[PDB]
Scaffold this motif. Structure first.
Motif, mmCIF file in Angstrom:
data_model
loop_
_atom_site.group_PDB
_atom_site.id
_atom_site.type_symbol
_atom_site.label_atom_id
_atom_site.label_comp_id
_atom_site.label_asym_id
_atom_site.label_seq_id
_atom_site.Cartn_x
_atom_site.Cartn_y
_atom_site.Cartn_z
ATOM 1 N N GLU A 62 0.808 -1.214 0.000
ATOM 2 C CA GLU A 62 0.000 0.000 0.000
ATOM 3 C C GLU A 62 0.847 1.271 0.000
ATOM 4 N N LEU A 112 -0.472 -2.700 -13.875
ATOM 5 C CA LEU A 112 -0.854 -3.420 -12.666
ATOM 6 C C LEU A 112 0.298 -3.501 -11.674
ATOM 7 N N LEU A 114 2.213 -1.244 -10.654
ATOM 8 C CA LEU A 114 2.566 0.112 -10.272
ATOM 9 C C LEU A 114 2.867 0.223 -8.783
ATOM 10 N N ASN A 115 3.988 0.877 -8.469
ATOM 11 C CA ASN A 115 4.376 1.275 -7.116
ATOM 12 C C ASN A 115 4.223 0.130 -6.114
ATOM 13 N N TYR A 226 8.500 -0.155 -9.081
ATOM 14 C CA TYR A 226 8.021 0.448 -10.317
ATOM 15 C C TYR A 226 7.695 1.916 -10.094
ATOM 16 N N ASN A 228 6.633 5.963 -11.634
ATOM 17 C CA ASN A 228 5.641 6.599 -12.479
ATOM 18 C C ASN A 228 6.092 8.051 -12.583
#
Ligand SMILES: Nc1ncnc2c1ncn2[C@@H]1O[C@H](COP(=O)(O)OP(=O)(O)O)[C@@H](O)[C@H]1O
Lengths: 267, 601
Positions: A62, A112, A114-115, A226, A228
């Motif tokens: 999270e 999918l 991501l982060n 990952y 962004n």
DNA sequence: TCGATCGATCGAT
DNA sequence: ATCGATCGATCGATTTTTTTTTTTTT
């Protein structure tokens, strides 16, 4: 907080409760092993985390940034408290991970991913050299001649020694902390291709403790996370917004291991 | 608003397929049932079924598509919500199909928008994934920034005024990369069709786009059947300008049938190890127990051919298995092996193999002298497109876990060939001069196509001087089986009366006993067995080899032995059985001795 | 020459 | 008499690409 304090506290009741190798668990002593040599690159086992407390797989994705930060606070408040003389050399810490139950090949990751937590490998190509960065927000007031104080986003509050005034400012080339920097270009091996086409690639950032470790033309293993890029100029667009991709480096393992290498069993 | 009619229409479409859709059965929920766990957000639909039950929503759907398009996502949501505990995460991917009309690039004008017309072409210069945080959250900076709005627009725009307050409308809140909408696509170009080959003009290029689940199941070299959803695309255009601007052309499409590049591996509807891997037990039981199966197999692929009957029993060798055993990290252990052909001029040297490429999959054939010395390596480039040296492919290495034979094995330069001198056994190849420490791997077998020196077999010289080349290569080819020419009328009249039943258009071939499909499927079942060796031949091959070299006590040794045990473990794979036996030994020994005494002068 | 900045001004309230 | 909206005078911010001479490999 009540629960949101328990993370570091479980690390504290981890590094002197979980045991392997017939007593005298590693992280009881691995941390002082590393404070001796002045390395500041402590490393974690994930499988040991699954052996002790499996809670730390769902609580992580999270915002793993905050997980890593709440990790490093513990190493600080341990080491610099128990080795108070230490606070001279570097005075900053972070930790590493080297155990992940998955190798994600290239050309397999999308929005999918991501982060969140990753593992990937490949090959290096040409990239930049070695450069330092900034670390902290400090200016110099230019109307009244004071300094605004210490504070990818700007802050600029009105509060400052100049009667909370002087919207204007100027900046010095000192008294602010810096940070080493380097870039990489990750390309996939020419073995595990789709058998004869162009390859795919991503860029990766690594940070100050990790530099002059990689090289052009090498074998690789990285956890990474990952990124962004938050905006490549959103506006009247192409047939695509001009958006981009990076992974941020946490921990590398090299596959060649050209040094004196393996950690040591107790017996 | 326009699309409320489409709302009601697809509402009652839902309400019908909510019940049965086809004969008390449903074909458009079980995709949704598989969807129900991961929620991947795709369900393609037949357009023919629109013509079946909904009674011509085509002219309802096929002109004002784009404005109706987003309403069908809400339709999809109203479907999925009816039975599952549902959040608005549901999304609309589409892979439309079953549409009759299939047009080309040229019938394109300003009147062709919002349709579903179908197109083909070829794939070139493809481009990668390129993500997009299409959405986020954006308003004033006081407190009230929770904005699930339409900011996904093509032209993207930060500026939003407010929802709750009266505040700034030029100062934005910052962005959301956390709890928002992201998606995935790619982008290519496509050239003029080869199914539509006019004269005159160039290969007019089209821009063209694919959605997420469409991504990376296309590829270079493929012909297609797409959607026709041409769009308004958000110097030199010196027309009139207005405001209360010069566009180019673009296009997208949201359905694929990437055909002419599809086999599917092996899955009598019955019980088996897997779903359909060998569900033909009903007959494969017989195909593994017959005693004349060897000959019945031999004559089951060459009815249009007649010659020797010795490689019609061997060459199954190449397509047949190897070992695939469980060992330690000692080294690679190898499974398949070479074969060779030499012969007099055109005794059908080439028709053996011109067809074999069409026989099994993954094994494409051609020659390398069709091109440069880029058979082994890719095209050596020394000009700047990306980083001035790009050699990561070839043509020989395009046959991984399949074969790529050659013709004219002799007249080829000794660069690819000297590279073959290593590339077949230590099946790992390397280079320099443009290599990022080049580490490749080929894996596969070969078939040779030699031709004598003078084009005759005058036994005046040894075989190694009958070809008079460099030597060591002629061992790792573990079987040769040369075809000879003579002059006898009976054979040639037999051939001409093969042609008697090649064009007598009814019954222009001979009867057979075993059909091809059952053969190939038995073959592709026979590998996955994990063979076993526990047999006294396994104990007593030492004397067989010792006797072999008692004959050779009058080139030599154990490369041939490696072959031997693999030839025979293959001939026991042919028995659909593990647990090696001592007869496949004796046949393999006979084949060995045929080869060597064939080599003997 | 183009754009937002800021300060002033004119009806509403 | 208080206050918001619109006008308008005031401010600062943008404007560098096609041949050549060495170099590795066929
Ligand atoms: N036993 C045979 N069965 C079938 N065809 C044969 C046989 N013997 C000779 N032929 C004929 O010989 C021809 C050989 O031509 P081919 O060797 O393919 O030419 P090239 O040498 O240029 O490859 C074939 O087309 C085939 O018709």
């Amino acid at each position: 907080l009540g629960p949101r304090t328990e993370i570091a506290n479980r690390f504290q009741s981890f590094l002197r409760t979980f045991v392997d190798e017939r007593g005298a668990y590693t992280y009881r002593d691995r941390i002082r092993r590393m404070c001796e040599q002045n390395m500041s690159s402590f490393v974690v086992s994930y499988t040991d985390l699954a052996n002790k407390e499996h809670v730390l797989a769902y609580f992580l994705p999270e915002a793993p940034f905050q997980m890593l930060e709440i990790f490093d606070k513990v190493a600080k408040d341990m080491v610099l408290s128990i080795f108070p003389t230490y606070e001279r050399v570097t005075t900053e810490i972070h930790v590493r991970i080297s155990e992940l139950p998955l190798i994600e090949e290239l050309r397999t990751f999308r929005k999918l991913h991501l982060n969140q937590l990753v593992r990937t490998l490949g090959v290096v190509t040409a990239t930049t050299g070695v450069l330092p960065q900034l670390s902290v927000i400090k200016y110099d007031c230019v109307k009244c001649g004071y300094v605004l104080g210490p504070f990818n986003t700007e802050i600029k509050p009105g509060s400052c020694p100049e009667c909370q005034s002087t919207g204007p400012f100027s900046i010095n080339m000192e008294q602010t902390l810096y940070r080493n920097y380097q870039k990489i270009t990750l390309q996939e091996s020419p073995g595990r291709i789709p058998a004869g086409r162009i390859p795919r690639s991503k860029d990766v950032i690594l940070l100050a403790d990790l530099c002059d470790q990689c090289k052009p033309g090498d074998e690789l293993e990285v956890t990474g996370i990952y990124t962004n890029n938050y905006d490549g100029s959103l506006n009247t667009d192409q047939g695509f917004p001009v958006f981009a991709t990076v992974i941020i480096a946490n921990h590398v393992v090299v596959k060649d291991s050209k040094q004196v290498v393996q950690s040591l069993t107790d017996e | 608003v326009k699309d409320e009619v489409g709302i009601r229409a697809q509402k009652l479409f839902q309400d019908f397929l909510e019940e049965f859709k086809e004969d008390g059965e449903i074909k458009y929920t079980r995709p949704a049932a598989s969807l129900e766990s991961p929620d991947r957000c795709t369900l393609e639909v037949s357009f023919e079924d629109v013509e079946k039950y909904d009674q011509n929503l085509a002219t309802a759907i096929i002109e004002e598509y784009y404005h109706i398009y987003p309403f069908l996502c809400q339709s999809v949501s109203n479907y999925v919500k009816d039975r599952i505990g549902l959040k608005t995460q549901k999304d609309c991917y589409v892979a439309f199909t079953e549409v009759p009309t299939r047009h080309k690039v040229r019938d394109l004008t300003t009147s062709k928008i919002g349709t579903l017309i179908r197109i083909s072409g070829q794939v070139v210069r493809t481009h990668p994934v390129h993500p997009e945080l299409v959405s986020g959250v954006f308003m004033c900076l006081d407190c009230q920034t929770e904005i699930r709005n339409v900011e996904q627009q093509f032209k993207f725009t930060n500026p939003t005024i407010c929802r709750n307050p009266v505040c700034s409308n030029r100062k934005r809140f910052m962005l959301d990369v956390e709890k928002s909408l992201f998606l995935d696509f790619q982008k290519i170009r496509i050239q003029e069709t080869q199914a539509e080959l006019p004269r005159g003009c160039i290969p007019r290029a089209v821009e063209i786009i694919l959605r997420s689940e469409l991504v990376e199941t296309v590829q270079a070299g493929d012909r297609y059947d797409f959607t026709g959803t041409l769009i308004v695309v958000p110097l030199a255009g010196v027309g009139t300008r207005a405001e209360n601007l010069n566009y180019r052309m673009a296009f997208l499409a949201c359905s694929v049938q990437a055909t002419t590049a599809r086999f599917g591996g092996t899955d009598t509807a019955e019980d088996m190890k897997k779903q359909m891997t060998d569900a033909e037990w009903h007959k494969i039981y017989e195909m593994s127990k017959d005693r004349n199966l060897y000959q019945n197999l031999i004559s089951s692929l060459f009815p249009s051919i007649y010659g020797n009957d010795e490689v019609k029993r061997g060459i199954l060798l190449q397509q047949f298995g190897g070992v695939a055993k469980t060992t330690t990290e000692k080294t690679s252990l190898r499974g398949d092996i070479n074969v060779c052909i030499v012969g007099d001029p055109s005794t059908a040297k080439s028709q053996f193999l011109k067809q074999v490429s069409d026989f099994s999959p993954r094994a494409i054939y051609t020659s390398g002298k069709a091109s440069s010395a880029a058979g082994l390596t890719a095209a050596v480039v020394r000009d700047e497109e990306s980083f001035d040296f790009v050699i990561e492919a070839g043509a020989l290495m395009l046959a991984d876990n399949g074969i790529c034979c050659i013709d004219e094995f002799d007249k080829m330069d000794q660069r690819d060939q000297v590279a073959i001198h290593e590339a077949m056994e230590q099946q790992t190849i390397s280079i320099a001069r443009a290599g990022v420490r080049a580490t490749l791997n080929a894996r596969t077998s070969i078939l040779a196509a030699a031709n004598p020196i003078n084009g005759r077999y005058d036994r005046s010289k040894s075989l190694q001087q009958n070809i008079q080349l460099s030597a060591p290569i002629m061992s790792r080819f573990d079987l040769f089986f040369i075809l000879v020419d003579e002059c006898n009328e009976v054979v040639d009249y037999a051939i001409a009366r093969k042609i008697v039943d090649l064009h007598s258009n009814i019954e222009e071939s001979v009867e057979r006993a075993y059909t091809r499909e059952e053969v190939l499927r038995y073959v592709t079942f026979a590998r996955q067995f994990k063979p076993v060796i526990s047999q006294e031949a396994g104990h007593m091959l030492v004397e067989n080899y010792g006797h072999l070299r008692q004959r050779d006590t009058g080139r030599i040794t154990v490369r041939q032995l490696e072959s031997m045990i693999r030839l025979s473990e293959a001939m026991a794979k042919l028995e659909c059985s593990n647990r090696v036996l001592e007869r496949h030994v004796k046949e393999a020994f006979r084949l060995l001795n045929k080869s060597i005494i064939r080599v003997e002068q």
